């Protein structure tokens, strides 16, 4: 939240998302890179 002359964290949601097999093989082991996106199943929902 951006108030006048100050900003405050209303919340900070923190999560650990697994790196899918496909990324581990084609990105990390192949080129030493990751995707900047995290697509994963959390709480029975596909979240990106």
């Amino acid at each position: 939240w951006f108030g006048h002359r100050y900003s405050q964290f209303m919340g900070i949601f923190e999560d650990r998302a697994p790196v899918p097999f496909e990324e581990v093989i084609d990105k990390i082991n192949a080129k030493g890179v990751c995707r900047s996106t995290a697509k994963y199943v959390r709480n029975n929902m596909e979240t990106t």
């Binding site: 405050q8 964290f9 209303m10 919340g11």
Partner: protein
């Protein structure tokens, strides 16, 4: 035949010499170093209702 003459007998060994003394026996220290600290912090709660 003749009798055997006296054998040379064993002797009491001289014994062990002991020095008297005062000892302090030290072991490896496994105790963590302990000291006093003070924490200063602020519990910040934001409730969305």
């Amino acid at each position: 035949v003749q009798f055997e003459q006296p054998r040379r007998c064993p002797t009491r060994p001289e014994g062990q010499n002991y020095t008297e003394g005062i000892a302090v026996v030290f072991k490896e220290n496994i105790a963590p170093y302990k000291f006093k600290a003070t924490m200063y912090y602020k519990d910040v709660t934001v409730s969305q209702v």
